[PDB]
Amino acid sequence: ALTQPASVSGSPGQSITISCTGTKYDVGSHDLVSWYQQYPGKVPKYMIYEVNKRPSGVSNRFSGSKSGNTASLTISGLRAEDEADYYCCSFGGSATVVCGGGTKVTVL
Amino acid sequence: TVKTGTVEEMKNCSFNTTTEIRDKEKKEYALFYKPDIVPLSETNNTSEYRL
Amino acid sequence: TRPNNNTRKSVRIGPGQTFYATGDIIGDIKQAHCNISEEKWNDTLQKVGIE
Amino acid sequence: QVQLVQSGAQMKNPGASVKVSCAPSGYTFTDFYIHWLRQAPGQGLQWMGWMNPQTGRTNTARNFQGRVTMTRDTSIGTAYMELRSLTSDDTAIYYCTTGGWISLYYDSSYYPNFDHWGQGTLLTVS
Ligand SMILES: *[C@@H]1O[C@H](CO)[C@@H](O[C@@H]2O[C@H](CO)[C@@H](O[C@@H]3O[C@H](CO)[C@@H](O)[C@H](O[C@H]4O[C@H](CO)[C@@H](O)[C@H](O)[C@@H]4O[C@H]4O[C@H](CO)[C@@H](O)[C@H](O)[C@@H]4O[C@H]4O[C@H](CO)[C@@H](O)[C@H](O)[C@@H]4O)[C@@H]3O)[C@H](O)[C@H]2NC(C)=O)[C@H](O)[C@H]1NC(C)=O
Ligand SMILES: *[C@@H]1O[C@H](CO)[C@@H](O[C@@H]2O[C@H](CO)[C@@H](O[C@@H]3O[C@H](CO)[C@@H](O)[C@H](O)[C@@H]3O)[C@H](O)[C@H]2NC(C)=O)[C@H](O)[C@H]1NC(C)=O
Numbered sequence: 001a002l003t004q005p006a007s008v009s010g011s012p013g014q015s016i017t018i019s020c021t022g023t024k025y026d027v028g029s030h031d032l033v034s035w036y037q038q039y040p041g042k043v044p045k046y047m048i049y050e051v052n053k054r055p056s057g058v059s060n061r062f063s064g065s066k067s068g069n070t071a072s073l074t075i076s077g078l079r080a081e082d083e084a085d086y087y088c089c090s091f092g093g094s095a096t097v098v099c100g101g102g103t104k105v106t107v108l
Numbered sequence: 109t110v111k112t113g114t115v116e117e118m119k120n121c122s123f124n125t126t127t128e129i130r131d132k133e134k135k136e137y138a139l140f141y142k143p144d145i146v147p148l149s150e151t152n153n154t155s156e157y158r159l
Numbered sequence: 160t161r162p163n164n165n166t167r168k169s170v171r172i173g174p175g176q177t178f179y180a181t182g183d184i185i186g187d188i189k190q191a192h193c194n195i196s197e198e199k200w201n202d203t204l205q206k207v208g209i210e
Numbered sequence: 211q212v213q214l215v216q217s218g219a220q221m222k223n224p225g226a227s228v229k230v231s232c233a234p235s236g237y238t239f240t241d242f243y244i245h246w247l248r249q250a251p252g253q254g255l256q257w258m259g260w261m262n263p264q265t266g267r268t269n270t271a272r273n274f275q276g277r278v279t280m281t282r283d284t285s286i287g288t289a290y291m292e293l294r295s296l297t298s299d300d301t302a303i304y305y306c307t308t309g310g311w312i313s314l315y316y317d318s319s320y321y322p323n324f325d326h327w328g329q330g331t332l333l334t335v336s
Contacts, residue, residue, distance in 0.1 A: 004254075033322070034322040034323065034324070036255070043305065043327045043328070043329065044324075044327060046324065046325060049323045055325075087254055089322040090322060091322065092257070092271075092320070095164070095186045095317075096257065096269065096271055096272075097257050097320055099255040099256060102255070110183065110188075110267070111268060112267060112268050112279070112281070113262065114265065126173060127171065128173065128175070138170065138180030139180070139181040139184070140180070162315065162316055162317050163317065164317070187262060187267060187317045187319045188267060189316075190315060
């Protein structure tokens, strides 16, 4: 459940975006969207908790947004450290949270 | 005891309600608050209650 | 406010009458509460004291 | 800092059922929800259920209704998750994660704020 693109790429120094989309119930009803980074073979990491707020330790390169039944992360100032998978998890059905399939980032 | 967890204020009551047809009764339930519910008389402190 | 996400289910009784009662609480458990500012209430009791 | 310890790797035949265990450290156990997550090998994250350690209330996704049950022991300071009716497709990494903050006045259960993640444990069905 919940749709996400498969992959995205760009050169160093560029900025890219990763999008997530769901029904009017999951993402359209609440501002509860969070983005998790995962390097391969590692536990995920914690990037964005509410749709456009960061925790401590996360760079300002990352920022999020919402529009209607869809939301998207923004990665700015690309470098080799940003080569990792990114998943979105958002408020789901009744009292649940549903997570997307994930997007891979390739820095040329 | 909703989903493995206790709720202190609401009782899950089950009662035999009458269908549209006068002959056939049906077993039905609903979550009644406390205050609305009182223990029933003439029983040995069992789980029998009334409005 | 009443934080919890009550549902609502209808119980058919008799010829066409229905009886609406809670069916489930699809979420977590809460406390119903009312909030007042402490500073404003201190002012509104100080002035009532003066008058 | 805070750490979430989990059980070691597991191996099973189909239909055996497994009770995975989690043990948070560094914060009061009953101050934050516990959210259970799954990651099949090569697949994306999937959400299983959350738990209220203060009162044991729990909820699970529609595709695990009855198939999964989770409980806890506040004295030990640990949480358990029983998965039932194992198939070969249940081979996955299982994560124990720290959710929102419990409070009596607003439902923070469904908040996707997984602040701290367990090390993850591999369950194998074959
Ligand atoms: C009636 O009155 C009562 C009594 O006043 C009201 O109850 C109060 O309601 C408040 C909310 O309106 C509630 O506030 C919460 O207090 C806790 C206490 O610690 C606080 O943590 C909460 O704030 C966090 O969560 C919110 C969620 O949106 C965030 O917006 C906020 O920025 C905080 O986020 C940080 O902490 C979270 C803790 O879970 C993290 O999950 C989150 O991601 C974020 O990051 C931290 O962790 C990161 C690592 O993961 C780290 O890098 C970073 O630096 C951060 O440390 C929230 O403010 C009061 O607690 C509550 N009071 C009581 C007694 O229950 C009631 O609402 C009123 N009702 C009405 C209708 O008005
Ligand atoms: C509070 O509870 C209400 C229900 O009492 C929750 O709303 C319900 O959310 C579900 C999402 O799983 C909706 O289900 C969907 O319904 C459509 C048809 O409307 C169907 O095509 C989908 O396949 C799915 O079954 C349900 O309709 C919706 N009901 C209402 C009345 O809105 C709500 O999400 C809960 N909110 C919280 C914060 O707990």
